[PDB]
């Protein structure tokens with residue numbers, strides 16, 4: 033709201049702000065000891081939080097050299113030596129909070145059974161890092177005596193932590209906004225170098241997102257980044273997924289539609305981080321339940337090492353199995369038996385049995401882990417796709433599928449259970465589609481189709497029927513939603529990785545009959561690595577053309593057989609003299625089999641095993657036939673196969689080079705090339721790392737998912753409404769806050 | 779130095795110093811670097827050859843035993859596919875040096891059952907092994923040059 | 925040569941207006957400018 037801000041700017045508020053800040057500073061500096069005013073300090077922390085929220089909301093987004101910015105600047109200038117001691121107190125308390133339990137603190141240990149003393153604490157603090165005279169004097173004054181024995185460091189460091197962190201982050205955001213708004217102001221500069229620790233402490237927790245909306249203006253909005261979210265970005269899994277997404281968008285994806293894919297990737301990565309956070313180390317019926325939950329958590333935590341151990345066991349079993357020998361007399365016909373040739377020790381069959389049982393156990397462990405880990409992601413993907421197809425499209429409402437996609441019918445036949453959005457966040461999807469398609473179609477038909485209950489209960493409440501029956505025993509008879517479980521089984525069995533793992537399971541189970549089927553598990557794990565995936569993908573990239581070329585080989589060899597059947601019959605003689613039943617070109621099928629059997633394995637055509645054409649007529653016809661067969665068949669077929677595979681390699685390398693070059697020369701989010709950001713040194717490096725660092729948008733979206741609308745700001749509410757509407761106009765697109773606003777005013 | 783010193787015993791070790799200086803020139807460095815540019819992929823492809831030939835040996839051990847006879851008549855101890863290790867060695871020894879698959883040295887499948895199974899086995903072995911392996915090696919080296 | 929020709933023709937169709945001689949850089953001042961330029965002003969099939 034511009035009018036309210038303009039009216040409030042011309043008011044006698046800055047003096048009140050200065051008075052409040054001075055009063056608060058003297059509150060902390062005087063009334064902090066005696067350990068009897070915790071409630072007062074909590075109240076002042078809350079009041080300071082509300083005050084800085086008011087200041088931030090008053091500032092918001094504006095012109096880079098606006099009047100409100102100058103007013104705020106002179107308010108800070110008049111507030112010199114009024115917030116400095118507050119910042120110093122916050123910095124020293126944060127230092128105390130982080131130092132306790134960091135280094136040599138579990139190694140120093142004055143009292144193994146008791147606590148530290150005042151002199152001991154002073155000596156430790158002097159021996160520590162970043163401690164000054166007046167600061168340690170004030171800390172000793174604020175340190176409670178408790179007879180120099182009951183100094184509980186654990187209860188002292190965690191005393192005022194969350195409000196202090198919130199105030200520090202908010203004041204850091206405010207100072208960063210003031211620094212970024214005015215380009216050059218020496219007063220704010222020299223006010224800033226004195227207070228640098230409180231700014232550097234919150235350096236990696238300050239986001240930056242640029243929006244084009246809000247009356248066609250560009251402003252930077254700030255937010256908080258959780259520590260767990262920052263620590264979850266260093267896993268190679270997420271980086272590999274991001275690289276795969278970027279490659280898919282650049283190569284396979286088109287234009288003017290990338291941003292929906294970006295939002296989908298952000299949502300998927302948010303769900304992945306939520307699953308990873310849930311699957312963590314900290315995590316008689318109740319004991320059994322918690323033991324089962326802990327076991328499943330441990331199993332889902334370790335999944336990639338289990339596949340490696342399975343591969344190792346497969347190699348070990350295969351190496352052990354390279355000892356068989358077929359014998360007639362069994363030492364321990366149609367009675368040939370298979371036995372190990374050990375010749376050194378008899379501890380071979382027990383080793384094989386133990387390794388087989390261990391391999392089976394690892395196989396069951398990994399299939400249970402896959403069922404417990406990756407299935408929710410696919411379920412959430414399907415639910416999100418159904419929500420998108422039902423809300424903004426009439427695939428199951430306006431029109432109908434044309435009986436061509438079985439997945440469409442299967443996804444349609446789930447709209448009958450109350451527990452439909454099990455994992456999708458926006459539970460208000462049925463209400464949303466009812467409100468959207470409420471006037472054009474009857475409400476009763478929509479409720480019947482979606483399985484919604486009576487609309488009388490929804491429109492008018494009763495506030496009198498709130499039952500709560502006791503659980504007792506056997507509460508799982510109603511917990512099954514039959515239809516939802518059937519749909520889940522269908523979608524989990526139509527998948528690919530689960531089908532492959534099930535094939536692995538059944539092949540191992542069939543191999544438990546002491547056979548080579550364990551040795552048949554080799555390539556299926558040998559192709560499940562990262563660095564052979566590229567080679568196998570290059571081979572299978574031209575999947576159809578190779579099959580077509582093989583069919584062309586079959587057609588050409590067949591036509592050659594037909595044209596050589598009724599002209600050349602006595603030449604084919606694959607035997608010696610005095611043998612009448614030895615022709616291999618009498619039957620058409622046998623002649624075709626012989627021509628294929630030779631022309632696929634050659635290098636001398638067919639003339640290396642057939643009677644030489646002597647002076648018995650048809651000499652020139654036979655030789656021109658054979659030489660043209662050689663040339664056409666062998667040269668064309670081998671050359672096309674080689675050309676297809678070489679072209680596959682070249683196409684793969686070209687795609688990789690193109691995607692790397694495009695990522696190196698454009699901003700992806702913004703449409704400006706790498707030429708406009710060369711006016712300043714390292715301009716493009718800072719442009720894609722500070723303004724819109726790609727990963728910053730995901731952090732902002734995850735922050736926006738939390739912090740419900742009861743506490744949203746204007747910008748947050750606008751962004752949430754825009755995201756719910758799914759129109760994607762708040763993205764920077766053309767301008768990137770460097771032009772127009774900073775083109776002239778800098 | 780140490781190879782020359784060991785070669786001072788009047789042997790061929792002096793003649794073993796040839797390639798080590800033959801690859802220390804400027805204009806062969808580019809060709810040798812192009813060959814060794816895809817160092818890991820060639821080793822992986824060789825390992826894939828070993829895996830595929832091993833699986834073919836396993837699937838051909840318990841189905842085709844009387845066909846392998848690398849001798850003449852009136853000779854009982856001449857099977858080269860009885861032992862698993864010997865059969866694997868024979869399949870590697872043939873499938874790495876071929877051009878006629880394995881059918882240039884093994885008894886022809888006559889009308890004694892398993893004729894179609896044996897022929898489809900042999901032709902798919904030829905196609906997969908030889909075509910895939912040679913094509914991947916050629917593709918790797920051409921891609922290195924490019 | 926075949927792959928190069930296909931890539932070149934696709935890239936040229938993706939970066940020029942064919943009918944007009946202006947490149948795909950002048951229609952970036954507004955969001956989705958080039959998408960609307962070849963779909964509304966001269967959609968090629970409109971001339972037929």
Ligand SMILES: [Zn+2]
Pocket residue numbers: 699701702703704719724768
């Ligand atoms: Zn940009």
Ligand SMILES: [Zn+2]
Pocket residue numbers: 941943944945946961966
């Ligand atoms: Zn045009």
